[PDB]
Amino acid sequence: GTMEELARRVGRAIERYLNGEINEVELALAVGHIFRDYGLEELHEIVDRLLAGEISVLEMLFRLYEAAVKLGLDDLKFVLLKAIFKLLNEPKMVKIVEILEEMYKRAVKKGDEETIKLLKEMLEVLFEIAKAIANNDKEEVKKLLAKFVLLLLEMVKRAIKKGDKETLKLIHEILDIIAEIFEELGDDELAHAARLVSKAAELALKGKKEEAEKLFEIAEEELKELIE
Amino acid sequence: GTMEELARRVGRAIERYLNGEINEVELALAVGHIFRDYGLEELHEIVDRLLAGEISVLEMLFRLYEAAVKLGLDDLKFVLLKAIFKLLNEPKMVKIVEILEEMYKRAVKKGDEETIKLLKEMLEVLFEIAKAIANNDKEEVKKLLAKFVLLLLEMVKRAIKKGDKETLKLIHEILDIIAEIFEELGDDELAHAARLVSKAAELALKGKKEEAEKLFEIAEEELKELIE
Amino acid sequence: GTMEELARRVGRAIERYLNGEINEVELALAVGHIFRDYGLEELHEIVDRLLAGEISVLEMLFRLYEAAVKLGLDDLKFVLLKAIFKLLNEPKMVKIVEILEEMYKRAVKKGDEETIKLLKEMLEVLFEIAKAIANNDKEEVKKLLAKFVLLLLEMVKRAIKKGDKETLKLIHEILDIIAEIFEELGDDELAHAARLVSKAAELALKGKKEEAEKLFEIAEEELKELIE
Ligand SMILES: [Zn+2]
Ligand SMILES: [Zn+2]
Ligand SMILES: [Zn+2]
Ligand SMILES: [Zn+2]
Ligand SMILES: [Zn+2]
Ligand SMILES: [Zn+2]
């Protein structure tokens, strides 16, 4: 069939595994069969490695995400990222990925192609964040989240000069979630920068976009300072 | 292999599922593999739908039966009908299907081809009965059972002019089962018509086939009157 | 992939089944998929017979071993023999198979091709021993073990004329295990012959190979006498 259904099938299999309905061998067999039905041989080999017991579910998910990045499948990428962020107990990251998926789905139905590369760099940053979390190395997580906040700042700067309004709300929600994450990680300056960007986006959405440029430059200067 | 081996394998898998030995994912994987081994692609997609959790076992069985009717596989049809009538708690309908299957196996080893279309029509009627039962609509069940009784009346009329004797006993047993079904459904007139046909068949089998016809047209007018 | 990784994958699947991690349907599906991935169709049909419930795991292992003997896969043969001797509660035979596979692995990395045929004959003898045990027929087990001891005697006679030293230790350990097996089987003469051969091997390894030959012919005539 089409690549959209394939992602739905794989996602349903992974949710069945996560909820406890099926086990690892059943999940491996089902996902390998699904991938083989669509002709994806590399993904089938990666799942075969799980079927042999060499790797675990999280490692298989990481390798599947890398392979899908090489191939260029988007819905499968979002499904795999949500599964990765659900295997690790982080509901906030899953919420961020869900909002980004909604943004991507809104973007693909129109001619906006400049945002797609953004939405993609941010997916790479999210993948690096997940990898760093899996390594239990908390120092790189903050820098990667700072890069994510900078990317969202660039996207909101692009969006303000246009007439979009739902994009502003979604970026505000994402930035609020990241600020909460920063607060839960024992950091205050990066959380303050994220809340500054969120406040600037809120001001721009409200109608007073003249006050937003000073907030934007202050926030970007602070973010650049804190990364180094 | 041959179409007879496939039916036995699928039936065995379904009994393993029904007895509680295997679960739904294992059953889906096994049955899809069996169908793929024999080159039946459409049945494989139908089972794939179950593997994704879109449909249940009963809906999958119904779709498999429809696909096998389109293809023309008989033993698979009988296996699927028995499974359908076993998932719904109706041993009597399973007994009717078993007797029909024995009749079909007896007929195929000889040159009798006229009984084949009648058995196919009765299989269609039984499929509609199962569908109506799944819909919990009790009004159409009685009408469909009346049509089934009329078809058995036609077959017994055909068989009496011939020398068949086991067919007479099997039709008598089937008619008794339908009479019990009608009695358990809170109906008395249709049960009386079914018992009238059974009595006519028994009289013809005994040797007094002169008295059978009066009963025969009496039962047929009663059945025609009760359908409308 | 290569035939070495296939044996590892199959052995891992069977180990998972034996340890209780997976059940018979999961093992059947996994092993059939593994054999299908490498293009081994006959092994796939043999596993299919297990998927349908016609045969059990032990019978499936026996048929797979016979088919691999016909095909000429050695690592798969060792894996299947180990699984067979693990399903039957016999750790000593598993130890014998492990030592034999170590000897085979040592031999295949050099130019020694004469030991390969003798190891093949001993593998046939061990397969016959497993078959006889599965039949609960104890009298043939002793004669087959006598033939195995004679084959080990031939190998030790060949190896003494060469400079091999680890081979002598391995045959000594194997002969000690067979002697323990004979003692546990309520036999003393065959156990005495096995211990005689082991003592001759130990004497030859120590450096006094002049006294080994007398023990050698004594043990071989005793073994020939006891078989008849
Ligand atoms: Zn595979
Ligand atoms: Zn503060
Ligand atoms: Zn499929
Ligand atoms: Zn009455
Ligand atoms: Zn197969
Ligand atoms: Zn003694």
Distance CA B166, CA C85 (A): 53
Calculate how close chain A gets to C59, using CA atoms only, in Å.
Answer: 23
Cα-to-chain-centroid distance, residue A174 = 10
Is C122 in a helix, a strand, or coil? helix
Q: Is residue C168 within 8 Å of residue C184, measured between CB atoms? A: no
DSSP state of B19: T
Q: Using N-to-C axis directions, what is the helix angle for B24-37 and A24-37, rounded to 10°?
A: 40
| List of chain A residues whose C-beta atoms are within 8 Å of the C-beta of residue C26 | 25-26, 29
| Nearest ligand for residue C189 CA | 6
Chain A and chain C share a number of CB contacts under 8 A equal to 17
Distance CA C16, CA C24 (A): 11
Residue type for C220, please? Answer: E
Q: Which two tokens stand for residue A221?
A: 């200067």
Calculate how close chain B gets to C1, using CA atoms only, in Å.
Answer: 23
How would you class A41 by CB atoms within 10 Å of its CB: exposed for 0-12, middle for 13-18, buried for 19 or more?
Answer: exposed
SS (H, E, C) C165-183: CHHHHHHHHHHHHHHHHHH
The answer, for B57 touching chain C at a CB cutoff of 8 Å, is no
Distance CA B72, CA C89 (A): 50
Distance CA C219, CA C190 (A): 10
Characterize C101-136 residue by residue with b for buried, 16 or more Cβ atoms within 10 angstroms of its Cβ, and e for exposed. bebbeebeeeeeeebeeebeebbebbbbbbbbbeee
DSSP state of A2: -
| Nearest ligand for residue A193 CA | 2
**Does residue C72 come out as left (phi exceeding 0), alpha (psi in the -120 to 50 range) or beta?**
left
Q: Tokens 């009798």 belong to which residue?
A: B112
Is A76 in a helix, a strand, or coil? helix
Query: For chain A, how far is it from start to end, CA to CA, in angstroms?
Result: 48
Residue type for A89, please? Answer: N
Q: Which two tokens stand for residue A97?
A: 């990925």
Q: Dihedrals φ, ψ of A20, to 5°?
A: 95, 10
DSSP state of C187: -
DSSP states along C56-103: -HHHHHHHHHHHHHHHT-HHHHHHHHHHHHHHTT-HHHHHHHHHHHHH
Which residues, 6+ apart, have CB-to-CB distance to A16 below 8 Å?
A22, A27, B25, B53
Best CA proximity match to B168, nearest among B121, B103, B98: B103
Q: Which two tokens stand for residue C178?
A: 């067979």
Is A23 in a helix, a strand, or coil? coil
What's the C72 CA to ligand 5 centre distance in angstroms?
22
Distance CA B31, CA A161 (A): 57
**B: neighbours with 3+ CB pairs under 8 Å?**
A, C
Q: Is residue C152 within 8 Å of residue C174, measured between CB atoms? A: yes
Which residues, 6+ apart, have CB-to-CB distance to C120 below 8 Å?
none
What's the B199 CA to ligand 4 centre distance in angstroms?
15
The answer, for A16 touching chain B at a CB cutoff of 8 Å, is yes
Which residues, 6+ apart, have CB-to-CB distance to A52 below 8 Å?
C9, C12, C13
Is A11 in a helix, a strand, or coil? helix
Distance CA B43, CA B63 (A): 8
The answer, for B94 touching chain A at a CB cutoff of 8 Å, is no
Q: Tokens 């650049």 belong to which residue?
A: A224
What's the A32 CA to ligand 1 centre distance in angstroms?
7
Distance CA A150, CA B80 (A): 60
The answer, for B120 touching chain C at a CB cutoff of 8 Å, is no
Best CA proximity match to A228, nearest among A146, A151, A148: A146
Best CA proximity match to C171, nearest among C187, C144, C148: C148
C7: closest chain A residue by CA: A52
Calculate how close chain A gets to C33, using CA atoms only, in Å.
Answer: 9
Out of A29, A32, A53, closest to residue C12 by CB: A53
Residue type for B95, please? Answer: K
The answer, for A41 touching chain B at a CB cutoff of 8 Å, is no
Residue type for A4, please? Answer: E
| Nearest ligand for residue A179 CA | 2
Q: Which two tokens stand for residue A118?
A: 């953004």
Distance CA B42, CA A61 (A): 31
Out of A29, A52, A53, closest to residue C29 by CB: A29
Which residues crowd ion ligand 4, with CB under 5 Å?
B 188
Q: Dihedrals φ, ψ of A170, to 5°?
A: -65, -40
Calculate how close chain C gets to B9, using CA atoms only, in Å.
Answer: 6
DSSP state of C110: S
Which residues, 6+ apart, have CB-to-CB distance to C116 below 8 Å?
C104, C107, C108
Is B52 in a helix, a strand, or coil? coil
Cβ-defined contacts of C95-98 (< 8 Å, 24+): C95/C177, C96/C126, C96/C174, C96/C177, C96/C178, C97/C126
B14: closest chain C residue by CA: C52
The answer, for C71 touching chain B at a CB cutoff of 8 Å, is no
| List of chain B residues whose C-beta atoms are within 8 Å of the C-beta of residue A9 | 52
Calculate how close chain A gets to C198, using CA atoms only, in Å.
Answer: 40
What's the C96 CA to ligand 6 centre distance in angstroms?
23
